Ligand binder design. Structure first.
Ligand SMILES: OC[C@H]1O[C@H](O[C@H]2[C@H](O)[C@@H](O)[C@@H](O)O[C@@H]2CO)[C@H](O)[C@@H](O)[C@@H]1O
Ligand SMILES: [Ca+2]
Length: 404
């Protein structure tokens, strides 16, 4: 009978691709339906270009796509409206914020699958070894701790040891890190939900100069080419005091044979001062049925299964990825495995979004300008002051005549 073909997640990032294919195969086995998994590149913006090839061709060759939180405004024409396939009570089992994110001009483009937010990973053993009893609350403290711990560990002979690793490659991940820097210095949201391009200000400038000041000092020079997995691999081998990353790194760090198993915790990212806002960029992925699927009914059944309570629970327990169902945050098994799901719930609830709603279908162009100008500051090519000014002008061009 039909073959239900799924493109979602990547075998190049942690266990997400492997686990995704396993779930899709379990749905196939359970329902007696043939399925195939199509693998994707690591980086979201590369996945977007890949999938856009299928969409442009109206291709029936993928039935189900895992789409980024930043995509609904872009991909809406390519999505089957799910709204008629769910009751109001079913829909309300998901967080309203994400359902709303996924709903474009009344169309429910996708079901919420897992959410994410940026967080600070930190080595507890190393903090204790150097006399610190809490992870840093401010960026200055992160720097001070990173310098002292690095000096010590280098002297003890770990020539691989760094203070801080993050995503500084020129891609969507840098847009994520950079929104956290700017917002946590009181510099705004780059583009505000009302359309105001606010990034040209002295706080945003300072946030970027500060990041520049990390490169080759407390962070490796090569951090300007790091995505999620490059940062994670330095961290996970035991070679970084701190890491900025998404929740999925926690379960990987705790796995049997991880050199850092039991040595780390997580907390909110630092901020410039006590009265700045906490910054955690909102991430996460959704499940879309293709408008070009020849098998909508079967594809919707697979998507409902993937987004169900027990599959999200498995995602939580085994891959430490955040559910999109409030009821899982009180589940005894989810919580015992990841107590920090409860500790940082308010951080996840206040996560700051990238400007995907306000930029809509032009978001990818906006983000590319953002990561290229930010990157120019990380490389030392421009100061923050010049970069935010150039960014403002580029975003103004990009969004001219665009209204939300
Ligand atoms: O790189 C930007 C991208 O990061 C996150 O996507 C992660 C995801 O959270 C992880 O579970 C795993 O799938 O790695 C992905 C990175 O390739 C955000 O979820 C996403 O919104 C963001 O655009
Ligand atoms: Ca994650």
């Amino acid at each position: 009978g039909p073959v239900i073909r799924v493109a979602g997640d990547s075998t190049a990032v942690g266990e997400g691709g492997r686990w995704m294919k396993e779930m899709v195969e379990a749905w196939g086995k359970k329902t007696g339906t043939r399925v195939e998994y199509i693998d994707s590149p690591a980086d979201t913006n590369d996945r977007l270009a890949l999938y856009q090839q299928y969409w442009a061709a109206r291709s029936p060759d993928v039935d189900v796509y895992m789409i980024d939180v930043i995509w609904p405004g872009i991909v809406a024409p390519h999505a089957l409206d799910l709204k008629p396939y769910l009751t109001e009570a079913e829909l309300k089992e998901f967080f309203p914020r994400i359902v709303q994110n996924n709903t474009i001009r009344g169309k429910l483009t996708s079901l919420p699958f897992f959410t994410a937010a940026g967080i600070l990973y930190y080595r507890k053993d190393l903090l204790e070894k150097y006399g610190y009893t809490s992870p840093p609350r401010t960026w200055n403290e992160l720097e001070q701790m990173a310098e002292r711990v690095m000096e010590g560990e280098r002297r003890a002979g770990n020539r691989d040891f760094w203070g801080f690793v993050f995503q500084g490659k020129p891609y969507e991940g840098l847009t994520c890190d950079a929104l956290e820097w700017i917002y946590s210095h009181g510099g705004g949201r780059i583009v505000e939900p009302d359309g105001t391009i606010s990034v040209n200000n002295g706080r945003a400038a300072l946030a970027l100069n500060r990041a520049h000041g990390w490169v080759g000092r407390i962070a490796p020079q090569g951090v300007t080419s790091y995505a999620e997995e490059e940062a994670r691999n330095v961290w996970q081998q035991g070679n970084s005091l701190f890491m900025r990353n998404w929740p999925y790194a926690y379960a990987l760090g705790q796995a049997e044979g991880s050199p850092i198993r039991g040595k780390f915790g997580v907390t909110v990212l630092p901020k410039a001062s006590a009265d700045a806002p906490n910054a955690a960029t909102l991430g996460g992925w959704q499940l879309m049925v293709s408008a070009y699927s020849r098998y909508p009914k079967e594809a919707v059944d697979l998507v409902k299964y993937l987004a169900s309570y027990e599959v999200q629970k498995d995602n939580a327990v085994r891959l430490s990825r955040l559910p999109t169902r409030p009821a899982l945050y009180t589940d005894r098994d989810v919580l015992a495995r990841n107590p920090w799901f409860r500790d940082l719930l308010p951080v996840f609830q206040n996560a700051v979004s990238r400007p995907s709603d306000v930029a809509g279908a032009r978001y990818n162009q906006v983000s590319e300008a953002i990561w290229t100008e930010v990157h120019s500051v990380l490389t030392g090519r421009k100061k923050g002051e010049q970069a935010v000014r150039d960014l403002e002008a580029r975003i103004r061009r990009i969004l001219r005549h665009h209204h939300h």
